[PDB]
Design a binder for this molecule. Structure first.
Ligand SMILES: [Cl-]
Ligand SMILES: [Mg+2]
Lengths: 111, 240, 241, 243, 235, 244, 231, 195, 250
């Protein structure tokens, strides 16, 4: 039977300072016991000083980041170029993820 | 589906189908609502060109929407049934989800919303009906009387009338009803309602219907003899 | 008077849009004729190519509906092609559903029923065409069935359609009074085509070259149209007699 | 009367006045032609230069369908584009199911039936274009002209728009003088001349020439635009003939 | 007859222009924007003295930071308000923030032209939408049934609008206090109203950053009416 | 588009009337008269057939009087075809109620639903109303014997005696004259026939031009019987009252 | 006259009156100018106000980082069409990782406007648009009309008294086309062009609206004190 | 949910329903009323799947109350039971059926007779002198076969019911936290507060 | 696109007339005469075959149609409308009756279904009424022989005998004089031919006249043997030869 999910491995890490924040991720991409790429980035600048990573199944991860980046673009169009605050981004991402509650994006997301 | 915009604007800014629906209300039998200190009374005209009627089974002019709210009307009788049914369904639906019966304002607002929707929906004409909605909110003793009309506007009234020759009875109520001191008792409120209908009706025999609503779902319709006593009393005081 | 614009009854029980669709039939100014042999059914039609810039091979009012059924139209080409495409689809679907080739008369009925719907339903206009269906039916033999914008249809011993239809009709009537039979008593289809052209010449009073005519022939298990040279061969035979 | 107020209504003549009114919009438009040749077809069109501010070579009117069919039209330009968009869908579904690219007669009837469908109902308007189109298929070269009624025929030469009568007359001379046939490279040059001659009926604004062609030998059976040296050569040929 | 979405020869939609005539018949509504807040005031216009005037609801809350006043066929406004309230709350759910006043107005105006042969006719009501957000501050918008909206420093709509707008032209400046604006709405309403202005036939409201949208009590408005009459007699 | 040809069947006049409803009532006023009379021990339904031909099959015919269930019948005035659409709907509605509650439908409920269907055709859909007026005669255990009428407006009312169709003005004046509350079925039968006999546009009232039906409790003990009269039974009842 | 009740009816001379009446709504709209060089493309728009108390109606809308338009006529129709353009630009990016060509943008607007002119019930769009953009073939300027007709130009203008600016640009064609690698000078030429359509009024700080796109310049709009430089 | 009983006597119907609401290894509540008044002289007790029970009961209650207002008339117990059965009979062939069993106790005012209807989640209706749903019946039916008489009074019916509850408290595995008892008669519905 | 005619094309005029029904009845008046006569042991239905052209084969055009084995139909008015009604009537006899009860519908109920279809064309959106009147003859076990007329309104009436179309007024008068309740089937065929001669102008023979009966069961026309209960169709169309035999003893 066809299995729609896969595991592309890797790991990510976010730390917050006083006047800064970091989001780190390794650049390895795998399937089973094989290396697909040694440099395939999964930490992205999404605009409005928001960085994002969705680690796990890379297809779902890229889909989610792509949709959020697009959500930022339409937020500008619909609300007079207003800056999307980090708390507002977080809530928006909840709705993206929960929209697929019964066929989930298999990923751990950090912004 | 039939899609035609029947209700539309004219050059002078009027929606003629809504205004012609008001003319149907003007043709309908008179209906009056008077609210007292601890009650509301709904009075209704019944035209006397119809003899050989069966009053047991003939549809009554005042309808119960729930045990604590009533609805009378003026205009097209067939149209009124559709509004009454929808209101009754919404009353039970409100009890089911909110665990509390409707307020009179809420029920009025719903009926008024239905009427409005038929003024900007394709393929339908407006309701040729204006309603008087009266009752008491749950666990409340303040009397409520509201009016609706084909356009969809609604508002609260200390006393009001609708239907044929309603302008005459509204004239009567405007001078006879004191805001500072409403009818203190049930008798006073019924009498003022009967008096106001006697300006227009003809005879006080089987032409007047009276329904009294009191707090905590206490609604009763008066019989012929009970109403006839008010008619007999008013006429004797008049000869002066 | 909006009862003349859509297909509803007038005070005298008439459908004016149907009547005006009949007048559209003659807009091309072309006359058609159909006759039956023993083994065959022949249909002929005038071919008029006024513009010199036209490719004359593409100018046609005869259509091959199925392998066995042929159709000639009297009316404008867009409506003719509409009717032709639908008849082709109907004949193909019939074969698929019921396992045998659609008969000429059954297709005629089906197209007539479709035409009827346009006379009763308001949003669809009638097609301004008369459809003459021909075949050699495996049960009924040589067959001619004709449909019109009213949704009427009937079988024919022979028939004609167009502006000068009445002259051709009476010409054929008088022949069948004389011969005392329902068909052209002739063995080969070639001579039935010769009969058809000869009687059209007599009725219309005009002579024809090879490019002035268009011919369709139905035999058992195939319907086919004749080329300019096939017609020219046929015209030579008539002339030498 | 009132028979002309609604599409799909027969007049007492047996005519659809709304379709005839759409023909008037076609007659108002710029001139466009089609020339059938030995192993292909040539298309050409008049583009009126309304202003100096129009970018030359960058308001293309001739359209390609699939890879082997060219379409040009006169009248309401947007209606033409709508028809080509349909043509492209029809050609794509034909190739999808039957593998082979759509034959030109097959393609002609697909447009014909679609245009004819817009004369059947009062809820739609007829097309305000006459469309000249064609190309090369398995059976050789084909040229067609399609009208607002849905009527179409095959043509040796075709013309439509404001200068149609001038172009038709010039086309009729080519058919008479070349019974064996005209070559593809010749037809391009003749197309330029005929557009320049047909421009006499629209001579207030000066114009821009646009030519395309399909040819089994010259373009390998595909639709291409005539540009650069071959275009300027055809313009110079046309300039020499008017003087 | 003729189509609902038809253009006139002058290039205007018949039905939209006719709905504008209905709005002129409506009761007056005035809005004034300041740096201390936005004030909204309306003429109630009771058709009869028996009608309980406090049940006339022509000023309405959309969210805590956005208020709304109406004029024309006021029954038509119910579904517009319902849409505005849902749009405001829905945005807060999706983005964990207050929604911009302009964005709310734009959402309401998207309903306006969703009519034809969707609803059967345009709305017969104009709206004054007043609010505050962090970005553009205190704002007043006029939302028409054409689908167009303009921002205004001050604006009047309804039967006395052209007279009241000319008066607002002279009186408005960029340094108006909230108290000054309250009196100015009452002043201009009293001028254009048929019946004599009091607390029962006119209603005031405002929106401030600190306290949000508030409809004034009849007791509060009455004191502002009394303060206004004294100040006009004082010179 | 199609707007041009729309009659607009569901609009108000300037006076506040429904054009198509008024014109449908005008249509009904030319239909054969139908009378209903309610007695204390039963109900009579009488109806005059529209100008009969001598070659019409009379015994196997049904124009005016239709059975809705075992306890309810209707008399028709107007377009018979329109009436049959509504009758089949009413017959179905009665069986739905019986299936749901295991009880025969109350008369008013059946009447209200049929009247609500007619109402719909006057407010939405852009279709012509049904050109039909019904007299409903029925019995249930709540109100006993009941007579109602409904008309194309979808308005219905209850009656002691009523007429629909042609010459109702004259018919209603004669009923209003001779009707009384303690009346029996056999007396009501006589009143129904006498009223039709005077209001008829024909020369003389005969058995072949009449349909007749009674709803009595004349069965055995506490149960209702519907009697749709046969031709010979109408002939006998016409002789018995002394009309022929 | 009898043939202007709806868009589905041709006149006897072959005209669509509802489309022509929609065209009339553009002439009533405020003036807006478009022009380009080889490196940049500029929109200049005269904004209109209801009165002195009102704001000035925003004429310029951004469609992508490399494309946007100015409007003249019904502003809600411009919002519908610009929203459609945003979606088509966005579809091209997500599906093909490809910036939408300005020419394809025009083709898509043409076809969308056309469908409204051939079907019963609907109406034509009542707005004209000037689309500017920088794509893989350099700078572009388009003129959209609600008949469906889209045209690529070096410069143009639409709205009331647009003939004045259009004549100026027709004279200045040779000068402004070669303003390469100089944004401020190309805007100056556009501001001088729109000045030829002014009567009684002049260009003030909250009246003028300028937009620019180019080689190393995303589509950006200038209003308020940012346009004071060019008065 | 679990225990619901019903006994029809001479002049009344008595319904007894358990008070426990259990989820997992926790008795969440010990005072739960597993009944709804459908009309002044008709009471419905219910038991089955969590959520479904109350959702179904309240849905029926709303429909019967709607009927009462519309017709200004109380539906007979027989009529209400037939309506309820049909709803369950529809439900069993739905995508997700109501897993709810009910007893309907009513006093018919026209007949002057008490009536008890037992309806399971499939839509299986029976009129009975005494009824029970679930495992309760396995004890109570045989007990009532012995001790029940058709001419009993309400007080005799309550003692007969006490005998059932005692047997269930003795032999049932689960603690059902006693019962709420309600009586339906000519004067309507009332609750016995001390049981 | 799409059917935008969702409104009635037949409406009430101020006088109470339904115009399109009246105009449909006018179209029936213009139509060729057809008639029906009921006997004690059968029913006869008959009409003239008005040939559009002498080249046309009038055998291919059937004005008298079998609906079920025991029910037949004839018309006056518009032939195409009749043809589609016969198609719908045949189908409804199966879908709404035979596929449910395993037997053919009785005459009155099939008539009722045809009437319904015709009523719907009087009230539904975007359609005109049918321009025909039908005469439907049939037999069934519990009602015996019967004859019905169906009009454009959807109204139907049972008849002992009647006529519709061109010369119906005179033909009805003729039938009144000749009809009695003791008529045998052969006597009813004789009268049908006499009545129809009055309205026919040109040729009067078996090739210009179309006539069918509803009579005794015909085992020979069943097509199979072995089931005793199946005894064959009661509907039989008289041949051209069978008509000419009765025209000699006329
Ligand atoms: Cl068919
Ligand atoms: Mg059970």
């Amino acid at each position: 039977q066809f299995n729609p999910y896969g595991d592309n491995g890797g790991t990510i890490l976010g730390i917050a300072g006083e006047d800064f924040a970091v989001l780190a991720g390794d650049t390895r991409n795998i399937t089973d016991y094989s290396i697909n790429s040694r440099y395939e980035p999964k930490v992205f600048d999404c605009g409005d000083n928001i960085v994002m990573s969705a680690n796990g199944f890379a297809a779902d991860g890229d889909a989610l980041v792509k949709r959020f980046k697009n959500s930022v673009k339409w937020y500008h169009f619909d609300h007079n170029d207003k800056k999307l605050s980090i708390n507002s981004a977080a809530r928006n991402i909840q709705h993206l993820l929960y929209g697929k509650r019964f066929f989930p994006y298999y990923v751990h997301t950090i912004i | 589906g039939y899609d035609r915009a029947l209700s539309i604007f004219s050059p002078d800014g009027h929606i003629f189908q809504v205004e012609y629906a008001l003319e149907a209300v003007k043709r309908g039998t008179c209906a009056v609502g008077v609210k007292g200190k601890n009650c509301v009374v709904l009075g209704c005209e019944r035209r006397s060109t119809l003899k050989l009627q069966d009053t047991r089974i003939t549809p009554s002019k005042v309808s119960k929407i729930d045990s604590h709210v009533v609805l009378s009307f003026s205009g097209l009788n067939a149209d009124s049934r559709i509004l009454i049914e929808k209101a009754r369904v919404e009353a039970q639906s409100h009890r089911l989800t909110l665990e509390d019966p409707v307020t009179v304002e809420y029920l009025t607002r719903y009926v008024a919303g239905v009427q409005q929707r038929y003024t900007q929906s394709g393929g339908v004409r407006p309701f040729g009906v204006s309603t008087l909605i009266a009752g008491f909110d749950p666990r409340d003793d303040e009397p409520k009387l509201y009016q609706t009309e084909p356009s969809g506007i609604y508002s609260s009234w200390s006393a009001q009338t609708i239907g044929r020759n309603s302008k005459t009875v509204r004239e009567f109520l405007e001078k006879n009803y004191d805001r500072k001191e409403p009818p203190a008792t049930v008798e006073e409120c019924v009498k003022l309602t009967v008096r106001s209908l006697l300006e227009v009706v003809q005879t006080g025999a089987k032409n007047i219907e009276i329904t009294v609503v009191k707090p905590d779902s206490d609604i009763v319709a008066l019989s012929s003899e009970e109403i006839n006593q008010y008619v007999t009393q008013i006429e004797q005081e008049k000869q002066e | 008077g909006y009862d003349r614009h859509i297909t509803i009854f007038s005070p005298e029980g008439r459908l004016y849009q149907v009547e005006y669709a009949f007048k559209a039939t003659n807009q091309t100014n072309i006359n058609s004729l159909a006759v039956r042999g023993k083994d065959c059914t022949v249909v002929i039609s005038q071919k008029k190519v006024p513009d010199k810039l036209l490719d004359p091979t593409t100018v046609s009012y005869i259509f091959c509906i199925s392998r066995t059924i042929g159709m000639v139209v009297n009316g404008p080409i867009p409506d003719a092609r509409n009717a032709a495409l639908r008849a082709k689809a109907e004949a193909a679907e019939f074969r698929y559903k019921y396992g045998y080739d659609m008969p000429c008369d059954v297709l005629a009925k089906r197209m007539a029923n479709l035409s009827q719907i346009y006379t009763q339903r308001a949003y669809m206009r009638p097609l301004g065409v008369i459809l003459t269906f021909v075949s050699v039916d495996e049960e009924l033999g040589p067959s001619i069935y004709k449909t019109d914008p009213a949704g009427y249809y009937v079988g024919y011993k022979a028939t004609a359609t167009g502006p000068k239809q009445q002259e051709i009709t009476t010409n054929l009537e008088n022949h069948f009074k004389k011969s005392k039979i329902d068909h052209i008593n002739e063995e080969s289809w070639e001579k039935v085509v010769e009969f058809a052209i000869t009687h059209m010449i007599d009725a219309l009073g005009t002579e024809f070259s090879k490019n002035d005519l268009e011919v369709g022939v139905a035999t058992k298990d195939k319907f086919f149209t004749l080329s300019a040279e096939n017609i020219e061969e046929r015209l030579v035979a008539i002339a030498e007699q | 009367t009132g028979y002309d107020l609604s599409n799909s209504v027969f007049s007492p003549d047996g005519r659809n006045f709304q379709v005839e009114y759409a023909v008037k919009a076609v007659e108002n438009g710029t001139t466009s032609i089609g020339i059938k040749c030995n192993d292909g077809v040539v298309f050409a069109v008049e583009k009126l230069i309304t202003s100096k501010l129009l970018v030359p070579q960058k308001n293309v009117k001739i359209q390609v369908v699939d890879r082997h069919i060219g379409c040009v039209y006169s009248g309401l330009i947007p209606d033409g584009r709508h028809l080509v968009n349909r043509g492209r869908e029809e050609a794509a579904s034909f190739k999808k199911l039957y593998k082979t690219p759509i034959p030109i007669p097959a393609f002609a009837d697909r447009l014909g039936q679609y245009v004819q469908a817009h004369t059947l109902y009062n809820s739609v308007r007829p097309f305000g274009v006459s469309t000249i189109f064609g190309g090369v298929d398995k059976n050789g070269a084909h040229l067609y002209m399609l009208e607002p009624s849905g009527s179409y025929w095959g043509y040796k030469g075709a013309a439509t728009g404001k200068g149609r009568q001038s172009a038709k007359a010039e086309l009729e001379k080519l058919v008479d003088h070349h019974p064996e046939g005209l070559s593809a490279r010749e037809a391009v040059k003749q197309a330029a001349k005929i557009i320049y001659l047909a421009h006499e009926d629209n001579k207030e604004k000066d114009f821009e020439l646009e030519i395309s062609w399909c040819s089994l030998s010259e373009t390998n059976g595909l639709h291409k635009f005539v540009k650069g040296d071959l275009l300027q050569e055809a313009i110079d040929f046309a300039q020499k003939e008017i003087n | 007859d003729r189509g609902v979405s038809t253009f006139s020869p002058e290039g205007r939609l018949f039905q939209v222009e006719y709905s504008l005539e209905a709005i002129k018949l409506g009761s007056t509504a005035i809005g004034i924007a300041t740096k201390e807040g936005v004030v909204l005031g309306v003429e109630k216009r009771a058709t009869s003295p028996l009608l309980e005037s406090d049940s006339i609801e022509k000023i309405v809350e959309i969210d805590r930071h956005i208020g709304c006043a109406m004029s024309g066929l006021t029954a038509d406004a119910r579904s517009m308000i319902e849409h505005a309230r849902t749009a405001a709350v829905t945005h807060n759910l999706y983005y964990d923030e207050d929604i911009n006043v302009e964005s709310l107005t734009q959402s309401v105006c998207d309903l306006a032209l969703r009519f034809g042969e969707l609803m059967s006719r345009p709305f017969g009501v104009a709206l004054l939408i007043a609010g505050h957000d962090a970005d553009d501050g205190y704002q007043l918008f006029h939302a028409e049934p054409s689908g167009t909206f303009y921002r205004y420093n001050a604006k009047a709509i309804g039967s006395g609008s052209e007279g009241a707008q000319a008066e607002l032209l002279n009186e408005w400046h960029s340094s108006l206090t909230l108290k000054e604006a309250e009196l100015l709405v009452l002043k201009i309403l009293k001028q254009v109203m048929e019946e004599k202005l009091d607390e029962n036939n006119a209603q005031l409201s405002c929106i401030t950053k600190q306290d949000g949208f508030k409809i004034y009590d009849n007791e509060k408005t009455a004191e502002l009416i009394k303060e206004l009459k004294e100040k006009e007699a004082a010179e | 588009g199609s707007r041009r040809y729309d009659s607009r069947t569901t609009i108000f006049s300037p006076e506040g009337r429904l054009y198509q409803v008024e014109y449908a009532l005008e249509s009904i006023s030319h239909a054969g008269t139908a009378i209903g009379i309610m007695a204390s021990d039963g109900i009579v339904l009488a109806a005059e057939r529209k100008v009969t031909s001598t070659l019409l099959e009379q015994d196997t015919s049904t124009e005016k009087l239709y059975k809705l269930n075992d306890k309810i019948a209707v008399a028709v005035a107007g377009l018979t075809a329109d009436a049959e659409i509504l009758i089949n709907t009413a017959r179905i509605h009665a069986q739905n109620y019986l299936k749901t509650y295991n009880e025969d439908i109350p008369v008013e409920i059946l009447v209200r639903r049929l009247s609500d269907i007619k109402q719909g055709y006057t407010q939405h859909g852009g279709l012509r109303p049904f050109g039909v007026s019904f007299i409903y005669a029925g019995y249930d255990d709540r109100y006993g014997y009941q007579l109602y009428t409904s008309n194309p407006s979808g308005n219905y009312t209850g009656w002691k005696a009523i007429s629909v169709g042609a010459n109702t003005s004259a018919a209603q004046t004669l009923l209003q004259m001779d009707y009384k509350d303690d009346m029996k079925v056999d007396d009501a039968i006589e009143l129904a026939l006498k009223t039709l006999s005077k209001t008829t546009d024909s020369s003389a009232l005969t058995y072949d031009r009449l349909e007749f039906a009674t709803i009595r409790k004349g069965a055995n003990d506490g149960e209702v019987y519907q009697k749709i009269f046969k031709p010979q039974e109408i002939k006998d009842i016409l002789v018995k009252t002394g009309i022929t | 006259n009898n043939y202007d009740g709806d868009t589905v009816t041709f006149s006897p001379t072959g005209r669509l009156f509802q489309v022509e009446y929609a065209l009339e709504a553009i002439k009533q709209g405020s003036v807006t100018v478009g022009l380009r060089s080889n490196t940049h493309a500029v929109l200049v728009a005269l904004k209109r106000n209801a009165d002195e108390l009102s704001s000035y109606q925003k004429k310029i809308i951004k469609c992508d980082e490399h494309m946007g338009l100015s409007l003249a006529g019904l502003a809600p129709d411009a919002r519908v069409l610009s929203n459609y353009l945003r979606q088509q630009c966005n579809y091209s990016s997500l599906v093909f990782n490809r910036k939408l060509a300005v020419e394809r943008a025009g083709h898509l607007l043409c076809d969308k406007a056309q469908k409204n002119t051939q079907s019963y019930g609907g109406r034509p769009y009542g707005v004209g648009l000037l689309i500017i953009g920088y794509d893989k073939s350099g700078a572009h300027l388009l003129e959209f009309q609600p008949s469906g007709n889209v045209t690529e130009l070096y410069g143009t203008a639409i709205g009331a008294r647009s003939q004045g600016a259009k004549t100026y640009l027709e004279r200045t064609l040779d000068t402004f086309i070669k303003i390469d690698g100089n944004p401020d000078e190309l805007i100056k030429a556009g501001v001088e062009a729109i000045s030829q359509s002014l009567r009684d009024e002049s260009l003030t700080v909250d009246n003028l609206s300028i937009a620019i796109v180019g080689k190393d310049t995303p589509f950006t709009i200038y209003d308020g004190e940012a346009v004071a430089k060019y008065i | 949910m679990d225990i619901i009983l019903g006994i029809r006597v001479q002049d009344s119907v008595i319904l007894a329903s358990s008070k426990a609401v259990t989820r997992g290894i926790s008795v969440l509540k010990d005072s739960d009323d597993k009944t709804r008044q459908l009309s002044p002289h008709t009471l419905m007790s219910f038991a089955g799947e969590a959520g479904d029970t109350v959702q179904f009961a309240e849905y029926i209650q709303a429909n019967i109350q709607l009927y009462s207002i519309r017709e200004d008339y109380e539906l007979s117990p027989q009529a209400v039971s037939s309506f309820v059965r049909q709803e369950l009979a529809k439900s069993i062939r739905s995508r997700r059926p109501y897993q709810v069993n009910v007893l309907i106790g009513g006093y018919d005012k026209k007949k002057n007779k008490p009536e008890l209807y037992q309806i399971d989640y499939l839509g299986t209706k029976v009129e009975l002198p005494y009824g029970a749903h679930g495992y309760s019946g396995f004890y109570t039916f045989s007990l009532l076969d012995h001790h029940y008489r058709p001419d009993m009074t309400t007080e005799e019916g309550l003692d007969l019911l006490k005998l059932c509850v005692q047997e269930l408290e003795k032999r049932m595995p689960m603690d059902f936290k006693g019962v709420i008892v309600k009586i339906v008669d000519k004067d309507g519905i009332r609750q016995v507060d001390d049981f | 696109m799409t059917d935008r005619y969702s409104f009635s094309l037949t409406t009430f005029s101020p006088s109470g007339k339904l115009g399109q029904i009246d105009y449909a009845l006018t179209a029936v008046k213009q139509g060729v005469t057809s008639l029906g006569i009921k006997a004690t042991n059968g029913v006869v239905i008959a009409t003239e075959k008005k040939s559009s052209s002498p080249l046309a084969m009038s055998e291919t055009l059937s004005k008298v149609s079998l609906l079920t084995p025991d029910i037949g139909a004839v018309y006056s008015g518009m032939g195409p409308d009749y043809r589609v009604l016969v198609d719908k009537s045949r189908k409804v006899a199966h879908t709404s009756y035979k596929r449910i009860y395993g037997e053919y519908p009785p005459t009155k109920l099939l008539v009722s279904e045809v009437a319904k279809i015709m009523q719907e064309a009087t009230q539904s959106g975007g359609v005109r009424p049918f321009g025909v009147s039908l005469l439907i003859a049939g037999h069934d076990e519990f009602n015996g022989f019967s004859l019905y007329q169906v009009d454009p309104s959807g109204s139907y009436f049972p008849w002992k005998a009647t006529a519709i179309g061109k010369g119906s007024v005179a033909a009805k008068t003729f039938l009144e004089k000749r009809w009695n309740d003791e008529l045998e089937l052969e006597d009813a065929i004789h009268i049908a031919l006499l009545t129809l001669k009055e309205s026919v102008e040109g040729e009067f023979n078996g090739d210009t006249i179309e006539l069918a009966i509803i009579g005794d069961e015909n085992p020979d026309l069943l097509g199979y043997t072995g089931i005793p209960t199946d005894k064959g169709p009661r509907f039989r169309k008289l041949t051209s030869q069978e008509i000419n035999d009765r025209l000699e003893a006329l």
